[PDB]
Design an enzyme around this catalytic site. Structure first.
Site, PDB file in Angstrom:
ATOM      1  N   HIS A  14      28.768  -2.175 -24.807  1.00 25.85           N
ATOM      2  CA  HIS A  14      29.099  -3.303 -23.923  1.00 25.85           C
ATOM      3  C   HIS A  14      29.180  -4.635 -24.704  1.00 25.85           C
ATOM      4  O   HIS A  14      29.599  -5.647 -24.155  1.00 25.85           O
ATOM      5  CB  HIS A  14      28.109  -3.350 -22.719  1.00 25.85           C
ATOM      6  CG  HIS A  14      27.859  -1.994 -22.080  1.00 25.85           C
ATOM      7  ND1 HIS A  14      28.702  -1.437 -21.135  1.00 25.85           N
ATOM      8  CD2 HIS A  14      26.882  -1.072 -22.289  1.00 25.85           C
ATOM      9  CE1 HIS A  14      28.252  -0.242 -20.788  1.00 25.85           C
ATOM     10  NE2 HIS A  14      27.146   0.001 -21.470  1.00 25.85           N
ATOM     11  N   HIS A  34      23.902 -11.453 -29.543  1.00 29.90           N
ATOM     12  CA  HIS A  34      25.085 -10.666 -29.248  1.00 29.90           C
ATOM     13  C   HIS A  34      26.201 -11.586 -28.798  1.00 29.90           C
ATOM     14  O   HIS A  34      25.995 -12.786 -28.570  1.00 29.90           O
ATOM     15  CB  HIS A  34      24.779  -9.639 -28.152  1.00 29.90           C
ATOM     16  CG  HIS A  34      24.317 -10.261 -26.877  1.00 29.90           C
ATOM     17  ND1 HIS A  34      23.021 -10.690 -26.688  1.00 29.90           N
ATOM     18  CD2 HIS A  34      24.987 -10.572 -25.744  1.00 29.90           C
ATOM     19  CE1 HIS A  34      22.907 -11.226 -25.489  1.00 29.90           C
ATOM     20  NE2 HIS A  34      24.083 -11.158 -24.889  1.00 29.90           N
ATOM     21  N   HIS A  55      29.984 -12.270 -26.501  1.00 29.76           N
ATOM     22  CA  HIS A  55      30.879 -11.962 -25.412  1.00 29.76           C
ATOM     23  C   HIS A  55      32.227 -12.524 -25.827  1.00 29.76           C
ATOM     24  O   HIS A  55      32.293 -13.560 -26.459  1.00 29.76           O
ATOM     25  CB  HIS A  55      30.366 -12.600 -24.122  1.00 29.76           C
ATOM     26  CG  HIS A  55      29.004 -12.120 -23.690  1.00 29.76           C
ATOM     27  ND1 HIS A  55      28.829 -11.119 -22.754  1.00 29.76           N
ATOM     28  CD2 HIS A  55      27.759 -12.547 -24.020  1.00 29.76           C
ATOM     29  CE1 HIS A  55      27.537 -10.938 -22.540  1.00 29.76           C
ATOM     30  NE2 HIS A  55      26.867 -11.789 -23.298  1.00 29.76           N
ATOM     31  N   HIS A  58      25.085 -15.468 -27.720  1.00 32.72           N
ATOM     32  CA  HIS A  58      23.781 -15.567 -27.085  1.00 32.72           C
ATOM     33  C   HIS A  58      22.663 -15.141 -28.020  1.00 32.72           C
ATOM     34  O   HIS A  58      22.727 -14.057 -28.593  1.00 32.72           O
ATOM     35  CB  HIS A  58      23.737 -14.678 -25.852  1.00 32.72           C
ATOM     36  CG  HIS A  58      24.605 -15.149 -24.736  1.00 32.72           C
ATOM     37  ND1 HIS A  58      24.994 -14.328 -23.706  1.00 32.72           N
ATOM     38  CD2 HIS A  58      25.166 -16.356 -24.487  1.00 32.72           C
ATOM     39  CE1 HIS A  58      25.750 -15.011 -22.867  1.00 32.72           C
ATOM     40  NE2 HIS A  58      25.870 -16.245 -23.316  1.00 32.72           N
ATOM     41  N   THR A 111      22.693 -11.297 -17.688  1.00 33.82           N
ATOM     42  CA  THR A 111      24.065 -11.043 -17.238  1.00 33.82           C
ATOM     43  C   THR A 111      24.474  -9.555 -17.318  1.00 33.82           C
ATOM     44  O   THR A 111      25.635  -9.193 -17.132  1.00 33.82           O
ATOM     45  CB  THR A 111      25.050 -11.930 -18.015  1.00 33.82           C
ATOM     46  OG1 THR A 111      25.069 -11.529 -19.378  1.00 33.82           O
ATOM     47  CG2 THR A 111      24.641 -13.425 -17.920  1.00 33.82           C
ATOM     48  N   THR A 112      23.482  -8.709 -17.561  1.00 37.12           N
ATOM     49  CA  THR A 112      23.619  -7.267 -17.563  1.00 37.12           C
ATOM     50  C   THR A 112      22.381  -6.764 -16.812  1.00 37.12           C
ATOM     51  O   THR A 112      21.380  -7.492 -16.746  1.00 37.12           O
ATOM     52  CB  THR A 112      23.644  -6.761 -19.021  1.00 37.12           C
ATOM     53  OG1 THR A 112      24.161  -5.436 -19.077  1.00 37.12           O
ATOM     54  CG2 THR A 112      22.256  -6.791 -19.666  1.00 37.12           C
TER      55      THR A 112
END
Ligand SMILES: NS(=O)(=O)c1c(F)c(F)c(SCCc2ccc(C(=O)O)cc2)c(F)c1NC1CCCCCCCCCCC1
Ligand SMILES: NS(=O)(=O)c1c(F)c(F)c(SCCc2ccc(C(=O)O)cc2)c(F)c1NC1CCCCCCCCCCC1
Ligand SMILES: [Zn+2]
Ligand SMILES: [Zn+2]
Lengths: 243, 241
Positions: B50, B76, B78, B101, B182-183
Site C-alpha cells: 500500500h 512512508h 503517498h 509521513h 489514514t489506514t
C-alpha cells in the site's frame, strides 16, 4: 518532596505563575463543555478530610471536554487554602496569590484507569478556579463549608447531598489559561493538562475563615497553607482562550 | 470488522484552508535529534503493498514543544500517477504530487498499541513533495532502490542517511491539528504537523516513485491516498499569522 519521590524534580511541574501578557492567544481554544454536573440530592457524596486537603468524590456522568474529541470524566474535587490573613492558592497571577483555589480532577475517557493515565500526556485534566473575598455568602460553597466541622479530624469523612458542581466554578467558560504540567503532590506525575479560569469566584470573609480554620492535619497541627510553591515554566508557553 | 474507528468524526487527511487556520504563537519550531544516521547499521526499506516504508532505528527523538517528546518509528510516502497528484493533505483544494509521513510514538508509551486512540500518543510530521529542477540526493538514496522492491511485500536494506534531509529546512512554519491514521485502524488522537515549506524532487524522481512499485493482483502501486475528510468543527492551528 524530591526525597520520597523524584518526579517532583521533573522539568514540567505545577503550579506556575500566570503572566497574562506572556500568554499565547489561540482562537482554537473553544469554550469548555461540562455536562452532567447538576447532580440530584441522592445519592449523597463522600466528603473526606484526607490530612492534606478536603476532597469530594464525584459519581459517574460528569462529562467534560477541552476540545473536539478531547473528553474527560470528573473524578473528584478538592481545595487549596491559606490561613488567617494569608492567601493559599497554588497558581499565582503576576505574583499575586489568591485566598484559595478549587481543583476539579478528571480522567481522559481514552483511559479506563487513573493509573494508566498517570505520566501520559493529557491522561489527567484539572479545572482550576481562584476563590476571592466578596460581599455575599456563596450558596454553592456553603453546601460544602457548612459540613466541615463534621470532618475536622484527620481521616474523618461524612456524606453530603449532591449539588450542582458547576455552580462552584466561574461565570465565563470561554475565558481561561491552559498549560501542561504536573500533579502538585507526590507522585507529581507529568502530562496533566491544567485549565485555569480567568474569572474568579467569590466567598464571604467568613466562608474563607471557615475553610482555613476548621480542619486538622497530621500530630495536632492545623490543615493550612496546603499549597505547593511556584514552579518554573522551563520553556512552556501558557496559552489563553482570549485576546 | 470493516474497521470501526475509520468512521470516526475526527479523521485525516484534511483540506487545509489557511484563512480558517488559527495562529497560535505557542507553536515553536520543531526540534529533531539523532536524525543524522551513520551508514551502518542499515535500514529496512519495504514495499508493503500500500506504500513504500522505511523502518527507523532507536535514538531519533522529535519534540513538538517543551515536554512534548516523541521517538521516530518509520516513514512512508503517498503519491499519485503520471500527471495525477497523490498527496493526502490538500491546501485550499490543491493536491500536491506526493507526501512524506514520519510517524512517531510519544516517549509516555513503550508500545504503539498503548498509544493508539490515546490523545497525543502518536504524532506524524508531513511534508508535500513537488517538482524542482535538481535531483534530490537524500531521496535518491531511497528512490534508486525501488527497482529491487517492485514486487508487493518485498524489501531491501539501505545505508542509514540523514533522515532530516527528507524533510523541509523550515521547521518554524507549519500547520497542526488533531486527527487520525489514514489506514486501518484509523485510530484518532494523532497529532499531525504539516509543513508550510515543500520538499523538491526531480521529475524523474517523481516518475520513479509513481511508476516502479506494484500492489495487490498485478496492479501498479499508485494513487495511495485516502480522500480528504471533513474537519467537523476542528480548528487547524498555524505557527505563523
Ligand atoms: N493538586 S492535585 O490535584 O495534584 C492534588 C493535591 F495537590 C493534593 F494536595 C491532594 S491531597 C493529598 C494526597 C492524598 C489524596 C488522597 C488521600 C486519601 O484519600 O486518603 C490521601 C492523600 C489531592 F488529593 C490532589 N489531587 C488528586 C490526588 C493526587 C495523587 C494522584 C492520584 C491520582 C489522582 C486521583 C484523583 C485526584 C486527586
Ligand atoms: N498515514 S499512516 O501513518 O496512517 C499510514 C498509511 F496511510 C498507510 F497507507 C501505510 S501502508 C499500509 C499499512 C501497512 C503497514 C505495514 C505493513 C507491513 O509491513 O506488511 C502492511 C500494511 C502506513 F504504513 C502508514 N503508517 C504506518 C506506520 C507507523 C507504525 C505503526 C503504527 C500503528 C498503526 C498501524 C497502521 C500503519 C501505520
Ligand atoms: Zn489540587
Ligand atoms: Zn501516511
Amino acid at each position: 518532596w524530591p526525597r520520597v519521590s523524584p518526579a517532583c524534580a521533573g522539568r514540567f511541574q505545577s503550579p506556575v505563575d500566570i503572566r497574562p501578557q506572556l500568554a499565547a492567544f489561540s482562537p482554537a481554544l473553544r469554550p469548555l463543555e461540562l455536562l452532567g454536573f447538576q447532580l440530584p440530592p441522592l445519592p449523597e457524596l463522600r466528603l473526606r478530610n484526607n490530612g492534606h486537603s478536603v476532597q469530594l468524590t464525584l459519581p459517574p456522568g460528569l462529562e467534560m471536554a477541552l476540545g473536539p474529541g478531547r473528553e474527560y470524566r470528573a473524578l473528584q474535587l478538592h481545595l487549596h487554602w491559606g490561613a488567617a490573613g494569608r492567601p493559599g492558592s497554588e497558581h499565582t497571577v503576576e505574583g499575586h496569590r489568591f485566598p484559595a483555589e478549587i481543583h476539579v480532577v478528571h480522567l481522559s475517557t481514552a483511559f479506563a484507569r487513573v493509573d494508566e493515565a498517570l505520566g501520559r500526556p493529557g491522561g489527567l485534566a484539572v479545572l482550576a478556579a481562584f476563590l476571592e473575598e466578596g460581599p455575599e455568602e456563596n450558596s454553592a460553597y456553603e453546601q460544602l463549608l457548612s459540613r466541615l466541622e463534621e470532618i475536622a479530624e484527620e481521616g474523618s469523612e461524612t456524606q453530603v447531598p449532591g449539588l450542582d458542581i458547576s455552580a462552584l466554578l466561574p461565570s465565563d467558560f470561554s475565558r481561561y489559561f491552559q498549560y501542561e504540567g504536573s500533579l502538585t503532590t507526590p507522585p507529581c506525575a507529568q502530562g496533566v493538562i491544567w485549565t485555569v479560569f480567568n474569572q474568579t469566584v467569590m466567598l464571604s470573609a467568613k466562608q474563607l475563615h471557615t475553610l482555613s480554620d476548621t480542619l486538622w492535619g497530621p500530630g495536632d497541627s492545623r490543615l493550612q497553607l496546603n499549597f505547593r510553591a511556584t514552579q518554573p515554566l522551563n520553556g512552556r508557553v501558557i496559552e489563553a482562550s482570549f485576546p
